[PDB]
Design a protein around this ligand. Structure first.
Ligand SMILES: CC(C)(O)c1coc(S(=O)(=O)NC(=O)Nc2c3c(cc4c2CCC4)C=CC3)c1
Ligand SMILES: Nc1ncnc2c1ncn2[C@@H]1O[C@H](COP(=O)(O)OP(=O)(O)O)[C@@H](O)[C@H]1O
Lengths: 789, 311
């Protein structure tokens, strides 16, 4: 059968990567943005748009190529895609040059062992055909201009990029299958070309998988166990080993060390410089210059399949093939990261560094930053000296100052979209490991925002923040953490510059919030602001937060919106709030799943804590009972509350009498919110009862969506005619009628009204109403209105 | 039998009652707010309650705050029961604040089947070195585990610790925590009783217990092992424990397949006058006729050594 011999041929091709593939293979961890490898293409939901569009993301050396070859070998061994699919094809960007137009027939012939495949027989059922595109970072060189060029003929010879772009959007063999493995850097445009894909990220080894990999690498079990032990000797290296490529490099290095008699603990002692130490242990200036220039010209030309002409130009000869390179004549680097490492080393032995600084972005997914990363690796003073004294060469030093200037250019620029994320900058600053220049080039980050998804992220963030000395606003993202929280927040207590800490929407959980609480209550921390919206906390964290409040006198505001704290959680908080050393001023409690029962406790706070200025307890089932309990105790003029809010509290006119008492008595209760409450015209009249009081101080009174009517409209007129202090208002979603609007107009006409804003959003008025509103806006321009819907 | 107003109306007078000493409320679904109201009732200085049992009351972690306030404010309470309430590790964390208070006079504290985990154990440890009136503890039927037991014991090894009758019934343990228990037995001079039933200790675990049992400074006056899933391999260890421990005076071996050779070796060890054991149980196994004759004989010459060998 055709499929059987094709599978045998691809098994022969993909048996080894030399070294055997499956024997050295180790399982990886992948999660859809765990998703099992046997569970790829079936739709989890029965209404999934064509399942044939799945994209893969991962770091450098994560194993996208190894995953592709492993799935191809599984399809070649009778494991997967037997009863589901029948054909699997392999297409590579490096082999498929974009300058030479081609067709799908060319790709099939290249993939088929026989140069004469049954093209007529194999192009009838695309369902059982899957096309694999690995290393997508070499395809979008002209997608930004070839948007409208579409090819649908399989036999038509068109440029590779255009043909592949036609394939992606499911119009050439639309029902065929596609599997794309990409770097995550520059997917932003590609998602436009995607028709309901699934983005799956690759995370690599775990601890058990790492142990399995060291077992499968070394032929000696004892040597593998010693390697495993020395990996756990250095926590940094063990964390770095979640990338299989780093595991391969460290295993080869340990092999070279123990075969030559060198000790293995030196490899563990070496941190962050695995590539440089590996190269030094493996091992001339003309050879290094030629190889570096070859790598650099490959960088400019996007060429990996080098020919003899490049070596002639760079002075590289036939005797210049080593382990890093590979002969196939075809010259190719074994792994691209080595090529970027050599290119980075070139600029320290075109030599103008500015090409790295500004010509970034000409290549999709940005090979340059990784290059530049090793640049920060090499410019390190100790690492620079070691390189010079190990290769007898010299390293330029103005490159460090130029990199500094590039750091401020990246930090202080406006159009920050095109630049890569700040986490890459932190990777660089951790790679370099030079304290003083880290501090100097890092004092240019008053506000820091980072999103963390691995141990490397946490470690580099800890190092970087510990180096920081002039940061004010800091945010974190735990995008998937007790150990994580401890490792990060231990340094934050020692940070004497931080003032705002954002942690909204992070599902840091309750024990993480606890760990944060032990971090904060240290006297060193200077945080004055803590936002915790949608953190997923619960009543358990309230005890810890109460301890923090009772122990810390620097905190100013605090947010707890959308956490199911509950009335018990409020009861726990009030103990800390009532403490004489609590300096809280702004306290959000929106949508905290409260009830009226907690309200009583809150009341005590207002007469135990005087620093609490504005409260926001909206979107809770408080009700009339709770509002009355709060207000009756709030009526004391000594109460310092200003800007209470009861959005969507399910109230009615019953609590309006208590609110009237508050307005009559309190002299600082400026603002007040009541939207989405069925107050009614009786409720508005009850509010007017205290609004007309000469001692009133209310400077705003929101009434949006209160379900009002035109009956209490005279009350509105009275409020405007007599309240000389109120300066804002809101009446959205309130059917007041044309007569009411025109009476409002004529009331506002006189100079006795000091109102400075008013809203009538979203209703259907009259032409006469519109003329009246335009007129009143004309004679007095200060009284802004948002009458237009 | 079907209560905030009910609880207030009743318990208002109980604070003024100067004669009450024991208050049973087991199996009543008085709920959590009722338990709160009870707490405000108790902390009045008038009440003389020294005993409060609250089994299966349906409470939760919310009541623990109120109970902690009661403990920190009342110095007449002696024991306290909270069995079969889903207090949880957070509830224990709340209680320990009151327990650690210098004015807490608690002596007996039941926490059976309180849906705990190992995480609470650490907090409990502090209690043993903050409160010295706590004599006997009962934290059985929880998913404590080896980690929690080790955390508790490692901090319990201080000879100043006053704990006596700890119990870990059905805690899902194994031989790992047995070393920590051995350290406790080697160091503590007041840890008399100890329960371990329904724990897969094994013969290795029993040997580890023997490691500290043979210590001349031991004071263990009982060691329950029912349903521990033992075997006959550590049987010499049983013989050694009986021959050398002059302080142990009770035992339990129910649901433990020890074999006829083990039972007869136990008999011959017990025969001598050097053993001061005063009770022993072998309930629910299938022995031999020779075994029965040996047991009857040993009961005959020494009548003090009671046995419950009959199933
Ligand atoms: C922001 C984000 C998600 O970390 C990212 C964005 O883009 C990339 S990547 O594609 O450049 N891959 C890598 O940097 N891998 C990589 C890493 C480390 C060490 C090495 C490599 C490659 C060889 C040595 C340590 C952490 C990652 C990653
Ligand atoms: N599943 C795996 N099992 C064992 N080693 C792996 C695996 N994936 C990657 N590697 C290691 O990574 C190297 C190849 O990396 P590669 O797959 O080319 O990275 P990328 O897919 O990011 O280009 C190999 O030397 C190999 O040792």
């Amino acid at each position: 059968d055709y499929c059987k011999m094709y599978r045998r041929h691809v098994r022969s091709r993909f048996y080894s990567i030399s070294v055997d593939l499956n024997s050295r293979y180790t399982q990886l961890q992948l999660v859809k943005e765990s998703l099992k490898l046997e569970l790829l293409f079936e739709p989890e939901d029965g209404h999934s748009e064509p399942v044939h569009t799945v994209v893969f993301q991962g770091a450098a050396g994560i194993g996208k190529t190894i995953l592709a070859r492993k799935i191809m070998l599984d399809w070649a061994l009778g494991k997967l895609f037997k009863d589901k699919f029948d054909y699997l094809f392999f297409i590579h960007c490096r082999e498929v040059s974009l300058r030479t137009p081609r067709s799908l027939a060319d790709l099939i012939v290249s993939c088929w062992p026989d140069p004469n495949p049954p093209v007529c027989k194999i192009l009838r059922k695309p369902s059982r055909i899957l096309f694999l595109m690995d290393g997508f970072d070499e395809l979008q060189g002209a997608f930004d201009e070839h948007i409208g060029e579409v090819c649908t003929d399989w036999q038509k010879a068109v440029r590779g990029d255009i043909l592949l772009s036609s394939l992606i959007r499911k119009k050439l063999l639309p029902k065929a299958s596609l599997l794309i493995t990409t770097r995550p850097v520059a997917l932003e445009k590609l998602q436009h070309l995607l028709d309901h894909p699934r983005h799956v990220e690759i995370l690599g080894f775990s601890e058990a998988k790492r142990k399995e990999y060291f077992f499968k690498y070394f032929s000696n079990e004892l040597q593998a166990r010693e390697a495993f032990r020395l990996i756990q000797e250095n926590e940094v290296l063990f964390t770095m080993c979640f990338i299989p490529l780093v595991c391969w490099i460290v295993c080869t290095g340990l092999k070279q060390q123990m075969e030559t008699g060198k000790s293995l603990a030196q490899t563990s002692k070496t941190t962050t410089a695995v590539y440089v130490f590996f190269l030094s242990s493996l091992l001339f200036s003309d050879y290094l210059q030629g190889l570096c220039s070859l790598a650099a010209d490959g960088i400019w030309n996007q060429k990996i399949l080098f020919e003899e002409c490049d070596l002639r130009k760079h002075g590289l000869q036939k005797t210049d093939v080593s382990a890093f390179l590979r002969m196939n004549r075809f010259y190719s680097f074994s792994h691209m990261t080595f090529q970027e490492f050599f290119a980075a080393m070139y600029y320290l032995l075109n030599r103008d560094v500015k090409v790295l600084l500004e010509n970034y972005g000409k290549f999709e997914k940005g090979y340059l930053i990784f290059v530049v990363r090793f640049l920060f690796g090499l410019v390190n003073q100790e690492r620079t000296s070691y390189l010079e004294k190990k290769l007898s060469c010299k390293i330029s030093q103005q490159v460090r100052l130029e990199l500094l200037k590039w750091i401020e250019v990246k930090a202080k620029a406006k159009k920050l979209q095109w630049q890569p994320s700040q986490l890459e900058l932190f990777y660089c600053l951790y790679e370099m490991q030079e304290e003083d220049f880290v501090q100097s080039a890092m004092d240019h980050f008053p506000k820091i925002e980072i999103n963390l998804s691995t141990r490397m992220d946490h470690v580099v963030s800890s190092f970087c923040i510990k180096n920081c000395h002039r940061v004010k606003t800091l945010s974190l993202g735990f995008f998937h953490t007790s150990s994580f929280c401890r490792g990060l927040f231990s340094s934050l207590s020692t940070n004497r510059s931080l003032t705002e800490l954002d942690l909204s929407d992070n599902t840091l959980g309750d024990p993480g919030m606890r760990v944060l609480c032990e971090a904060l209550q240290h006297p060193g921390c200077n945080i004055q602001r803590l936002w915790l919206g949608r953190c997923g906390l619960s009543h358990q964290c309230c005890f810890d937060i109460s301890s923090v409040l009772s122990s810390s006198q620097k905190l100013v505001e605090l947010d707890l919106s959308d956490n199911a704290l509950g009335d018990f959680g409020i009861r726990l908080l009030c103990v800390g709030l009532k403490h004489l050393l609590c300096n809280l001023q702004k306290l959000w409690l929106v949508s905290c799943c409260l009830t009226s029962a907690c309200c009583q406790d809150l009341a005590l706070v207002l007469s135990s804590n005087h620093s609490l200025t504005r409260l926001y307890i909206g979107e809770n089932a408080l009700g009339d009972s709770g509002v009355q309990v709060l207000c009756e105790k709030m009526k004391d003029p000594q109460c310092n509350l200003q800007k209470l809010g009861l959005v969507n509290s399910g109230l009615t006119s019953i609590c309006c009498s208590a609110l009237t008492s508050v307005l009559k008595t309190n002299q600082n209760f400026t603002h007040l919110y009541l939207r989405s409450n069925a107050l009614g015209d009786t409720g508005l009249r009850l509010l007017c009862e205290g609004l007309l009081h000469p001692d009133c101080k209310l400077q705003m009174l929101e009434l949006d969506n209160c379900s009002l009517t035109s009956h209490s409209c005279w009350n509105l007129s009275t409020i405007l005619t007599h309240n000389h202090s109120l300066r804002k208002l809101n009446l959205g979603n309130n059917d007041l009628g044309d007569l009411c609007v025109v009476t409002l107009c004529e009331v506002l006409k006189q100079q006795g009204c000091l109102l400075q804003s008013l809203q009538l959003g979203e209703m259907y008025l009259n032409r006469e109403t519109k003329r009246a509103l335009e007129a009143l806006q004309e004679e007095k321009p200060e009284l802004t209105i948002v009458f237009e819907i």
